[PDB]
Write a protein that binds this ligand. Sequence first.
Ligand SMILES: [Zn+2]
Lengths: 176, 96, 1126, 49, 195
Amino acid sequence: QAITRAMADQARTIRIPVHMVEVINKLGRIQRELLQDLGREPTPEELAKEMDITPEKVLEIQQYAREPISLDQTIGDEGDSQLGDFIEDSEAVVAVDAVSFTLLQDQLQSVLDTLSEREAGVVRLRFGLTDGQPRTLDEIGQVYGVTRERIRQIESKTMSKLRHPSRSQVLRDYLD
Amino acid sequence: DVNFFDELRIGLATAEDIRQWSYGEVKKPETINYRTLKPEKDGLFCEKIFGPTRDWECYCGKYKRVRFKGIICERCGVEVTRAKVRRERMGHIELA
Amino acid sequence: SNNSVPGAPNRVSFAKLREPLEVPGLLDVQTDSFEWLIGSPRWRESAAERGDVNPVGGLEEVLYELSPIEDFSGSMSLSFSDPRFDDVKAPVDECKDKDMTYAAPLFVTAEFINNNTGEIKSQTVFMGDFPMMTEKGTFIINGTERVVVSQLVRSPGVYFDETIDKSTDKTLHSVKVIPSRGAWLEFDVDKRDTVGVRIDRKRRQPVTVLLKALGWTSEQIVERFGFSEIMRSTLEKDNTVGTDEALLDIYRKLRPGEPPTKESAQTLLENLFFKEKRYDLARVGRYKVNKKLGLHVGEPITSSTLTEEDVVATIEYLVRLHEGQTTMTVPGGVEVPVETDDIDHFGNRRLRTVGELIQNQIRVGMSRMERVVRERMTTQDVEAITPQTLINIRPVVAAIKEFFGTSQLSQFMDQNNPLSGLTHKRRLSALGPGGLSRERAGLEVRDVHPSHYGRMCPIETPEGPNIGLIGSLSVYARVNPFGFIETPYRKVVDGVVSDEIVYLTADEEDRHVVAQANSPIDADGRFVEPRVLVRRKAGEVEYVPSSEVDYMDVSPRQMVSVATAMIPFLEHDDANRALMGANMQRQAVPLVRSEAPLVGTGMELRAAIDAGDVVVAEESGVIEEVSADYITVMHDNGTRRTYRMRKFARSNHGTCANQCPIVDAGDRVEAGQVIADGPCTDDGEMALGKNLLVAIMPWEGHNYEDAIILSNRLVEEDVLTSIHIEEHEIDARDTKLGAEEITRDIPNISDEVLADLDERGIVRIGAEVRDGDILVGKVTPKGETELTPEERLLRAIFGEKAREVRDTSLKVPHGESGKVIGIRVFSREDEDELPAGVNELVRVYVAQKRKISDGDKLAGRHGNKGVIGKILPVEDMPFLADGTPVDIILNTHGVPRRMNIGQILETHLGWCAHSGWKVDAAKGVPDWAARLPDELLEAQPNAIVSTPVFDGAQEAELQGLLSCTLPNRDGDVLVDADGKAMLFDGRSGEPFPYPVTVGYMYIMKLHHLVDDKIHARSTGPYSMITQQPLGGKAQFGGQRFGEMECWAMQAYGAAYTLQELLTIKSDDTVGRVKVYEAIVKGENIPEPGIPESFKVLLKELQSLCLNVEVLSSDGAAIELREGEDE
Amino acid sequence: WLSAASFQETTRVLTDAAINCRSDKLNGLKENVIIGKLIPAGTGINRYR
Amino acid sequence: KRLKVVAAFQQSGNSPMGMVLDAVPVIPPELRPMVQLDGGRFATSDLNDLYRRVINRNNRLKRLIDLGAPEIIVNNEKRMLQESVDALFDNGRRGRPVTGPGNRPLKSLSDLLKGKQGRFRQNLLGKRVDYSGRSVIVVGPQLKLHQCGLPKLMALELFKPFVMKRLVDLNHAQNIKSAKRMVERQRPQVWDVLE
DNA sequence: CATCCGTGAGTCCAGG
DNA sequence: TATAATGGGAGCTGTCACGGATG
Ligand SMILES: [Zn+2]
């Protein structure tokens, strides 16, 4: 009892709960029961009905049963080629894509200018450029020295002023 | 991050030195979760110890924005910096 | 005529009449082996015709060794018998298509015997789906055609070696007993004249110690081994005496740490060497030991184990060989030659074919299920036990699945051209499990052995670091039931050659004396001269009276392989280039249509047929209907067999396997005849290339250092043009954000880029594709992370709401391009059984009609390689007087250096065959063309001929034929008796000052085309750990600037260049990004940062308890973009 | 120790170096290439730099 | 020989106690990464199964100690912990190496630095470089000694961000993003630009 | 001067 | 998790040349 418990608990490189192990061992059992019964490996559809009556999960279980492979393991023919040397770091940053972003910053700087100080005010407020946060609009007008929510009034005084650098298409390029 | 440093020293590392490096003791052999596929806590990939999986995204999800920088969420103790730290943050195991 | 056996084109051969035996079924190496494994009918009959007493199949054998399986009690007993197969679960073609494995399910009958209850429950058990071999001798594992290569290994037995002492300079003799599996055992002789033994590489002890351990009296030691003073010196220096004291002594040296009982030291000495469980010489292991010692030589093979008699007779063999004796009769055994054995001799080196390789893996799987069997016996109760409850076949299916999937012998079938595949089936690798490593192999294993004659080619082998470790099997060779390599020889009674042929193994031919094939023979069968050329043991040769000739070689081309024999005038090319010339033919690419070579060796026919990549008619009949699609044949008996044509199919190597019908409708055709040939096959002959009009001259430097010049004719007439098919894949999985769906709606893409798709999202058949274009429109849901506050703002202005789906489309890889020649769609919806997680799976096939270009590598059959330097306009080409521009301009400089004037001789015979010829019969038949067969005295324009290796054209006849050359249509002869001709420089107009050697040479297009080989990268993907670029064209990686290359920088002193490459060009995470910005903004290149690789190193040092600190000039430890905390 | 470690017998080199507490002055060709500093040769020397 | 060691522990205040560890450092995750492949299967680094081995045995030691197990049981656990940590630091060094699936010896920590393929000779003395390429070569008798024939296709990818620069320069492309798309589509303009 | 263990054994590309 | 059960099991085989610790 201590073995089979500690076995199911420790052996998987990615841990699966006790019952999940119980399942996979039942699945392998019913497979080998149908195996000698149908002279062939039984379809997922066949396996499902007999034990749990659900086919979608059997596909799922058989993937849980799959044991990982080492990165450090290699290809037999040449002793130099290891798997990990073929894994593209999906994390790392694309050069052009990050640079193109920066050129998009040079265009919004040519937008904070044609706009007024009131106009370039609410822009960086609810979108959060310098902040990094989008503050609720009923707090933005009150945190700003101008009231009567005239900061939402300046908003519409800006939306069309932004059409001009948009009619210059210098922002039109950076969306496609 | 200047490039010119004069010397590079190597020495036998103190047991205390090992602990000064580490942002935490790994206490579980577990790696990630089998369903959530997330680094399980106090494990070999625990985000409390080595840092967040995604940039500025805390583990339990209470903090997900760039606005919180250097904030240590109380619900799961994960500092909010880039996952870029998961390449630099040490761990340690305490042998009995 | 050469091969007047199938219905093949008439290729006239210069020859001495070769009628011993036709080239045996080349694929038989693969065929006959697998037939033994399954115990097929054709095998049992072949066992009968060979007169094999009580034949036991590979599968039958396994079960008998195994059966019966009893526990410690003997209470239970499980036994297996009668293995049988069903019909194959799916036809070959469907397997390749649906990526499933070609197999036929195996059954056995199992009964559970019980000695206590006495009852026996007997039923049939399923064993799994069993991989079957095709008619083409290949396997199909998951839709890819694979081949099991025959493994050259060390045969089990007892081997004797003579080593010379460095100090005493005396002869010391060593023995080594090698089981199929088990414990080691070697008897060696000191310089002290004391015999010693090492057991499983334990320390040395006196050999008498072992004899008194066996039970032999100290008096019998004096009797049996007294005839030497070295054994008398051994029993004398013997430490202890006594049967108890010996066993204890051996025990104490074998397993320290354990209590020595008189009953525990007697037990393991039995177990380590005399039981079927821990020790086992195979059938070969038993047979090879016996032959070497000559005991029970006539008695059939029943003993699978080593014996006491074997131990004694071994030590007797050691001592006699030590003091000079040459022969010895073992008491109870026939006389045996006494000498030191050569481990590399093909009589001691064993070729384990497919059958055994698969068998051994089967035996691994059985012993694993046997373990579960014995565990499932002690658990369940006696009454409720069925074999269905004892048996778990999961480790058996897992051991056969693994072999085909993992092993170094289950190979991707080399499929450039039919020959390439054919040779692949006949490779002889020494590498692989149970064999040796590449670093373990010294220089003796690789070089050419004398015993390879007629068994393994001495020419065919890789150029690389794998040299001499991989070889091809010789033409007429075959494998005998014990895994050795036999070869056909003609029997000579008394100076008279008999047509009776007997196959000889390596060591058997050593005990005889063989005459070379070309030794002159009387019309009856008698030799001409008393003394003839004779082959003898140890590769030594001497003239020997005809009284003493035992056998003679079947053919002059008997030593070579299938590929080697396709090299005309081979005996004129040094082994080095000849080697390449064989290796390279398997690199030839199938052209749009193919020509048979004007010069041949005869082998071109049988190679293509046996290759299996052509279409042969099974039964005689008449072509009832012919189409490009298929051929139907009306047999005589009334039945109809239709052959479906392979049309534009992708090989393993992306070459074009396309078959066309030869026969016209209503043609009467006989069986075995080629009715339709495939890639690199013209009228049923290997057409590896084209016949090209050559000119041997330096031409304005463009052919310098082995480069090649081409006529634009070869580009305008597709002469050197090929088809190349690629296969592209993409699937739609279930993700955590939803599921990937393949749709024609891709974010932010015009209706211009999408123009060539269908309503699904797939490209339409027949459309043309370039790189970058979209093949399969697939989108995936992207993680709902907070979009940029700068792009949020950019989405309010233009008011466009972002989609949660990111473009994951399958675009065409760089370099590739062509026409989309076929779509294959699998859905999980349309019940097509997919792997778990996948929904729609698409394959898009693209063919390329690649005309030959600059940089493409051309080669002849003589190791004369080279890439295309310049392709001149057809008018620039040096041309003959009648206006005909030559095709290919080879550099004269690179001919005499390579010793391969075979290319020259071929060129001569090439011209004679193009123009035709006619010997002068007036005043009789000339003395040069006296030996020339009648059929060649008159030859048409464009006539095909044969120059079989070690036979064929002689330099006399060739010189003669150059004078006979028929004039062109204008009635003028073109080339002279020298073989040269006058050219006109198509550029200057003036004629070239000196006659140039012109003629026709067969040229192949090798699979090294620039369209594949070219590659470059600016930025791209990067390594996950080292953060350096990735590697390879397939990964769009960068080049490597290695340790050697850095030295080249430092030597120059290009410090900045060198740094930049190792820093901002490589693994400086922040640098490469900012270098990109600096370039596109047109600024200056920044100062490089810290290599992320170096950072990794310090973390790898730290993690090894190595306190590494970087100090600044003061002495304080500084941070590396990181901090320390506890 | 950097030059030595990247030459041969790396485990041998490191054990010793870590015991002798050897500091390494990054003033060498091998030494510099590793850390990405300009090599002390050619256009790397201060004279020309 | 003995002094060559002892004198070294004397000199620097470098305690010899360090040779015995009470705590073992754990290398960062991204340096022992665990990755899901396109086949759904996970590929992980060896070090994690070695790390998993030490933890599982170190913890079993804690339970055995706590439970007051006999010395015979506990000592065995300690012995295993030693080989666990040893096989982590340098596998194969003492005894037979720890095999993963396929009787494959697992790469240990020190295995990351050893010999050719190691972190030193393979990743530091020579790296892979951006802005580079390869192709077949061909004699060019026309060229001058200081020239070489660089493939039109090869150059475009080598000078890729350099060409994009002049595309948005001479207004062929409105921004840097479009400039990219012009190059990847191999529009006719770029051949003039790259020249 | 001879044994036993541990460490070396060219580079780049390619592929499965 | 209460019948009684009590010490493992594959080995791996064809290098080569050298220095340092032991003889
Ligand atoms: Zn949290």
